[PDB]
Structures are given as C-alpha cells and as structure tokens.
Predict the 3D structure of the following.
Amino acid sequence: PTINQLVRKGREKVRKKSKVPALKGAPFRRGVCTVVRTVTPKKPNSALRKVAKVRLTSGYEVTAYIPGEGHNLQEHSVVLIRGGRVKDLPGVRYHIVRGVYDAAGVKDRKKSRSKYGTKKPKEA
Amino acid sequence: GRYIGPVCRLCRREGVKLYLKGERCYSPKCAMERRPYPPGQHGQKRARRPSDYAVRLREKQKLRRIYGISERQFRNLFEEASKKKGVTGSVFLGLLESRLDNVVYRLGFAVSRRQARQLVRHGHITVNGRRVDLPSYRVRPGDEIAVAEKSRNLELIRQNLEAMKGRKVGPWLSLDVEGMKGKFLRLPDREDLALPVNEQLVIEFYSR
Amino acid sequence: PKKVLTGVVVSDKMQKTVTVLVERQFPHPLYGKVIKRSKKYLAHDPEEKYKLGDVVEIIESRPISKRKRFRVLRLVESGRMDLVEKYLIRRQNYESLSK
Amino acid sequence: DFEEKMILIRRTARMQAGGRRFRFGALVVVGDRQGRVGLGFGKAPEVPLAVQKAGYYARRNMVEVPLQNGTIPHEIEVEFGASKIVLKPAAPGTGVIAGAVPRAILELAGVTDILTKELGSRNPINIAYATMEALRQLRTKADVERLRKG
Amino acid sequence: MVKIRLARFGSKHNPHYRIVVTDARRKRDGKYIEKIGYYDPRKTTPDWLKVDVERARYWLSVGAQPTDTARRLLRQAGVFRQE
Amino acid sequence: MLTDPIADMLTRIRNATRVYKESTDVPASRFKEEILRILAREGFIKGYERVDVDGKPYLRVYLKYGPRRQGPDPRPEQVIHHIRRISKPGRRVYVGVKEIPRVRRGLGIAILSTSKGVLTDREARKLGVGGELICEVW
RNA sequence: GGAGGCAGCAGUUAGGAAUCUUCCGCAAUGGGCGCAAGCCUGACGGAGCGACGCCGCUUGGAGGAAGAAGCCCUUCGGGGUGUAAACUCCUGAACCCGGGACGAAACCCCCGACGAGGGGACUGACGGUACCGGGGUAAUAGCGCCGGCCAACUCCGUGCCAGCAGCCGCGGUAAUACGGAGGGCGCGAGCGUUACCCGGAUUCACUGGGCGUAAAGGGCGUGUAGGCGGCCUGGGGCGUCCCAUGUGAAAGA
Ligand SMILES: [Mg+2]
Ligand SMILES: [Mg+2]
Ligand SMILES: [Mg+2]
Ligand SMILES: [Mg+2]
Ligand SMILES: [Mg+2]
Ligand SMILES: [Mg+2]
Ligand SMILES: [Mg+2]
Ligand SMILES: [Mg+2]
Ligand SMILES: [Mg+2]
C-alpha cells in the first residue's frame, strides 16, 4: 500500500488459533472416560491405537490418546488431559497424562519414565 | 554443582588436556597421554566431521570444564561479560579468572581447581584478613589472598607452598611463600592465560 | 496557559453560540505522514457578533454549557465561505453512504 | 594452502528410459583467513570429484575482502535472485553472527566480527553467490575518496 | 497534616529508611512530597544518617510535624540547634 | 505535472549514470541547484551549469565515473552507487540533529534542508541543526 | 419477632490443573486517640508451609593399574564403563559444646526555660536465631535426550504388531526413529511435559513484502470527500529545526 492507504486502513495484526480448547487456556484438564476403545490410523500407518473419549470439567467431550504400552482405563476412569495432538488419528487433539488420577503408570518402563508417569524402579 | 565425578575423562573428549587433577594430569597418566580418545563404546571410531554447532558446543564446554563452573553460573558470567565494557571474549576470561576458587589455584595454595574449591569452602582461605568460603567470590585488583592462620601448617598446605618455592606465579599476581600471602594485581590479559580455547567461538555459541 | 485554538465558524444556528471547526496536524505515530484531522467546538459568542465564514481564535474557558468550554477570543479574518463549503460538502456526502 | 570448507552437497537426478540418473553438486568455499575468498559450485557423477571441481572453480573465482580489524568497512545488502544478504560491521567481541552459508564464506575471508541476515529466498546457493557479491562491492574509505577528486 | 517521617526501603532484615515529607494519610511506603534524608539504623556504612537541613527547616516552618523517631534524627544533624 | 521534482532529479541522475552519460538536463529550481552544489562539493558529480533548452531553464549536470575496468564488462564503477529520496510529498521525513543518520558508515552522505540551508549530515551535525532528510547518497 | 454480609488477616466449603498458618509480635517503621503515661493497630515487622522463582552452597579433595570384579560390546587377541571403584592419605556439610548480636533511641526523667543544648532510665517479636570460638562424620543425585533440525550408537527383543511422533516421517525379521540393556550427549536439586506471550515470521513488511502466469488491478468511464501539487519573489512562522527553561514522582532499567 501507499503510505496514505496505510494511514487510512493500517495493517491487520495477525490473530491466531488454539489447537486446544482445554478451555480457559488451562494447561491440563480433568475428565472422565466415556468410552475406551481402539482406532485405526490414517493411511500411511497401521495400528490398533488406544484412545478414550473423555467428558471434561471444561464442558467439552473430546478424544484423547492413551500413550504407553498397556493401560488401565475403562468406562468411568478419571483422567488428566494434556494437549498435544497425534498426526495420525484425526480429531485426537489431546493426550492422557499417565500416572495421574486413574491412569496408571506404565509398567516395566525404564527409559523415558517421567512421561508415562512411572516411578523410579527399586535397585534392591 | 562442580560436577563431581570422573574428570581426566574430559581431560579427554574435549580431546585436549584440561588440568582437573592438577598433579597427576602431569604424570604419564592424564589419559591424554594414555587414551587420547573420547570415552565410551565408540570414541576410537571414525570421527564424523563436526556440525558448526558441535564445534562451538565443544569450545564452550572446554572452557567451562576448565574452571569447574555450572552452566547456569557460566552463561550468567558470560552475559555479564557481554554487557561489560569492550571485548567480551577477553573480559569474560578475566571474570572467570577473577574467581576466588581459581585465584587460589593460580597461587598454588592448591594443586587442582577442584582442590582450591574445597579449600576455599572449608575456611582455609582468607581475603584481606577475613575468611571467605565462596568459590564464586569475585577477586578484585589489590586484594590480599592468604591462607588462614589456623590452617597455616596443615600437611597439604605446606606440601603445596613447598612447591611454590621455585615457581613463578602468573604476572597479574604476586606471591609470598614464606608468609603464605598473595596479591591479585590486575585482571588477566587474554594472552597471560595460554588457554586451549578459542573464546571467540564461545561468544558465537551464545549467539544462537 | 488557557488553550487558544483558531478555526472557522461553520454553524451559527444556535443562540449565542457558534460552531467552530479546528483543523490540526500531527505526524502519524507509525507511518510518519503529516495528517490533518479536525474538531468542532461550540464556542460562546455572547454578543452574537460572529457570523458564518468568520475565522476566529477560540479560547479555553469556564464551562458555559455541556459542550461549550471555549469562548471566542477574536476575529482573525472574515467570510471564508470556501472552508465552510468544504465541511458541508463532507457532511452532505454522508447522505450517500447508508441503506 | 587455502583452507576450504564444504558448504553444500546435493544429489540431483535426471531422467532416462527406465531410470533416474544422478549427478552431485558441491558448493565449496576456499580462503586464507586474510581477506581472500572463493566460491565455486562443482558437479560430477560422484561426490569427491564434485568437491574437487568445486575447489578448482573457487580458487578460480576469488575476491578483495577489505578487512579492518576483523570486520567490514560498511553495511551492504545484496539481492541475488530472490535471495538477500544484509551485512553489517561489528566491533570486536561480536563474533561472526550468521547463517551456516555466509558464515563459512566470511570466516575464510578472515572476518572475525560481523552481523548478517539472510532475507528472501534462503536457497544456500543463491545466498552464497550473494554473500560473495556483497564482499565484491565493499569499498574502503580510501576506495571512495579516490573515486571523487577534481 | 503533613509529616517528616521514615519511609521503609532496603529489605528483609535490612532496614534502610528514607526521611521523607508526606501527607500523614499516605500509606507508609507510598508517594511522598519530597525526600530530604536517609537513615540506616544499623550503621553498616559511615554515611548512615544524612539529612538536607536547609529543606527540613523549610518544611518545619510550614507546619510539618516530624515523627518522634524522625525528630531525633534531625536533632542529631542539628536541624534544631540555633547557636 | 511532476509530483516530486527533487525525486525526478535524483532519478534523472541515476538513470543517466546507469548508461554512462557525460551529462544530463534537469528543469531548474533554486532548491535543485543547492542539492547539486553539494553533490559537486562531495565529488559525486563533476558539477553543473545553468542552461536554456528551447527557451527554458535547466541545470545541466556533469556526471562522474570511475576508470574503465578489465575483464568481461569494462563498464566503469559509479561514483554514485546509490541515490535515494528519503522525505517525499506522501511521507515527509524530518529529523532533529541528534537522530541524523550515519549513511554507509561515513562513506556516504545524507543531505537535508535546514533553516541554515541544505547541508550534509556532517555539516548539519557540526552546525547543531536538523531538517528535512532530502535524500541519501553513496 | 429477630439477625447477617471475609473483594481485611487467617481459615472452611465449592469450583479448579492449581495457590499457604484459623502462626509471633507491636521491639521497629507508619497510623488513630491522649497533656502524658499509654491504649488500639491481621497496616506493619517477623516467623511458617510450598524447588513456585532467582542467587548461593553441598553430596568430597589429592593420590590410586596399560587398568580387579560385575555388566555391555567382541573380528574371542581385545575393547568399553575408568582413575571410575576398591585402597592410602588429607580436609570436615551435617551434627554436638561454648559464647551470642545489630536492628534502640527516642518518647519519658533530671540540669537548662517543659527552647537549644548537656545528662539519666526503660524497651527485642524475629531469637538462644544470625554470626564468632571450640570439637567433629566421606556424608542425597537425578531428569531429558542420542534418525535429521540437534550435542550424543552399539547389542538384544520386536516384526505396519507393540508402539513412537513437534515437523519430515519411523515400525513389513540385519530398526542408530518402537521396548530394554550397555554406552553417550546435555543440564543438574533439578530435569522434562503441557498451556500462554514474543522470537524465529521481511508470514500485515514504518524500519521491511507484494498483485502478467504463484494469492492479488476494481468490467470501464465520470466524479464527491480526501490524499498529493511546476517555476520565481516577498510577508507570516502553523509544520520543521535550534537554544533555554518547567514537567517527565518513587521504585524498576
Ligand atoms: Mg522416546
Ligand atoms: Mg520464504
Ligand atoms: Mg475440587
Ligand atoms: Mg513480524
Ligand atoms: Mg510476499
Ligand atoms: Mg490458475
Ligand atoms: Mg492469479
Ligand atoms: Mg483492467
Ligand atoms: Mg479535490
């Protein structure tokens, strides 16, 4: 634009989009598993992926990935939702925080232990 | 902080002989002499040519390891140097070298910089007559750095000040072996320290 | 000091009041161009002495009504119906912006 | 005994009846760290000949860098294609503040302290070529006074 | 009324006051009319009580009351002695 | 009808220099001359002279170049590598003395209109005055 | 018929991913009342809890093998962990003993005049705390990452499963990308994660971008407001520039 145009109409400041109505802009959210179930990924990948539909304190029911080999979530398990999507399950915008509320840690886990909510194993 | 854990193992990896044990890292032993390759299952394999990052990471790490200083303390020390007047590289060394734990090593009251830390920290050092136990303490031009009167005749201190009869202490300093006193005269010039460290690459590390 | 402003009389439809239009110019805070904005001031004229086209110093004052906080200081020059016509064209053009 | 720094290796491909067919391209900077630098882009059916040729062409395309205590006489912005390099002298202690491509180029020229921005298209090649064009256009106070006399 | 009094600065276990003149109704640490001295009750430095006497006198003469504790400190720097 | 005669003058210089003209003509103004006075004084141009094309005042400006050069492309280097209007009718640029620019780190010149005349950055700074940033040259 | 209004300090309860003691003391500073003594002061000064944040400090130091064992790799000679340990000396966090603050000199009292000025008395929550002296024990280490960006690689298990994932994408039976081991890199009483802001983003571009074909010239005139306006001389001095001066509180920088 000419400077006069810029005077008259100016520049539109960007404005940008949450990936994550964990409402409020909370960093986490309590919810209850409504359904726990397995789903299949989008074309390139193939798996039986573990997700829970989750009804939230935030007023919203959404799906959420259950990370870790193995889990203990069932129909009313309480859960901490985390944010983070999965490039592979469409409309899974959130993860479940293992190690919190009714989400158990991941058993036998020994490497990336603090994700996966796993207590430091005893070196008896 | 001060790391705590195997040293003449980064006397290696940096691939260049720091002096973390003082006395042994002079014997046919600093492993630079024996095993001048990085630690671990690899180490003696084909060196892959370093990324521009690794070049600088290593240079930064080299310098830091030399003084036994936490990265948080180091970056701070560095950011202070940058704001300070004139050449950030040179100045930054001078600030590292102004440290009490290191001044004490440069005086040879202690063999290694680790040791100097432990001495300072245990009340054995005194600056201008009052006792200081803060390794990080900043030493200023004109300060008397002595050995505490009660500590004066300790096995380790006599050994160490016995070896200082003979030696020349770096030009920016004075030493009084008989009376166990030292004087920080001025800040170290960039050349007064023959450091195995291109400090200009360290500035560049912090530019990212 | 009491703020003095000068500008033209663009209305004298009121009793003992003239509407006085003040142009002013500032650099744009970001883009720097000198811009020209304008404000109208109701100005006390207790002796209905000022007429349309009069260019007048306006001076800050003890409130005289809601809106009126400026008396007419003096008459810089007279019959500038060109500046009056300008403002009225700007005003009449509004009739052609609605639905 | 110029130094040499290997800036870019890539493998291009072209097409033939039933086949992709490859070729390599190497961008190599060559320089003494004392005001002389070279850029060369070499291609060959295998990597080391490409690097080799690059080396050759660089030593054959070199430049007057007018250093001044490890920095540069004055600002320059060069556009090369849709790539842009901005170059700003700096006092000592600054370091060479630059992307990997123009860093290499400036280090081997013997630049110690300088500030830079890659703008526009970051394509390493056109950035390289523009860094070079920038330095090729630097002038010293002396170069300038000489140009204007009587 | 207006006051000559100690505004607390410094830090925890580090009292360092400013001798300041201020409406009585301000909060203690609030806005003040003018600074005149400073005071360090622990004399950690030799220049631990300072006062600008010629100003304190202006303020006393236009009806500022000093705090007991402030008075003591102006007295000590001879705001009150008159030869 | 020419919106910016100064700009047009600078542009006549740049256009001429890029084809290595001996000289060029620019319709005359006192202000234009004062700019040229400086270009000359700083050695970007050999100098100018008033003249009269078809009954009308121009300033014929005499361009200056470097030596002819070696290799493919022997075109002289420009003395005027760059000449750019700053202040312009659509956005006037004004700067006081303490924020006058240093152009190309000293090797360039800025030019401004001041209440003491048309000065360079160096003249102005040493006179203590700001003004309109007419243009920068290097 | 009455009573009530913690968005005062604490605290409860609910909501929440989540945020403290129903603490000590008016000794200080400040406030209200009083001639004063003094009363009141959840302002305040302190203590407590929380790695929430920042700064500082410790978990040893010097010696110690062509190099134990274990464990990992192995081309079955070795190689790695590693001077790391064991081991010898040395020092002595914590502890325990003794001593022990500054912060507090006024108000008041007496001489002087109930002024200035000189002299006297009381007063400490924090706190038996800080700190000083004397004894004195080798005394917590973990977290993330090692496909590229990005610093750091081998073996086993697995076989589009389990799983990883910020993007490219990894996983189909030799996977440096899954899981574990050893090894490494990076930080270190922390290390990661998620959320949000700026950066990178010259990707709203004043600095500092664009529209033939990438997104972008209005289908074309006419024209209102508006924006912009050739050459010369004078007056004004609004823009503009200069100087002085006031203001730009404190804190922060
Ligand atoms: Mg992982
Ligand atoms: Mg781009
Ligand atoms: Mg709840
Ligand atoms: Mg931006
Ligand atoms: Mg664009
Ligand atoms: Mg198309
Ligand atoms: Mg198009
Ligand atoms: Mg068209
Ligand atoms: Mg018009």
